[PDB]
Amino acid sequence: MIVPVRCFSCGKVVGDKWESYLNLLQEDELDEGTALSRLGLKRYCCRRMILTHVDLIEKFLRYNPLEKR
Template identity: 75%
Template sequence: MYHHGGRGLPGRCCRTQWAPRYGRAWAGLEIPLPAACAPDAAMIIPVRCFTCGKIVGNKWEAYLGLLQAEYTEGDALDALGLKRYCCRRMLLAHVDLIEKLLNYAPLEK
């Protein structure tokens, strides 16, 4: 789905079809807090499943808690209600890159 600039297919472009359904987080992105606001540098987990759009961002801490309580990965995902494999992969395949990204300062102009 590409943006058509208001021409061509009304109601079929990316802005009119996806934005009302998913809002600003339709791509599963979450804006990180600056380091001064978040001294613990929390995880940046995608808000929604990339494939089906189910909210998965609020399940990350519960998932980690279940893993620490000796649940297997599959049992923890079942307990959280993640049945579809597209949603399950969002938690299983997540890699925490925020610690590496915080090492680089933005360029100053």
């Protein structure tokens, strides 16, 4: 749903690199590989953490019982 705190395979913290990854892809016209390299994700175990995240929580957040629409 939301970005994992740590890479499963090794344990490197990657939860602080999701908004940064989206911003790197968005403003700077970068490909995914270069953006991942700039974030410091070297091993592919860490690279597929942010490369393949779907970020489903946003789709969850639009259904809000506690606020009128």
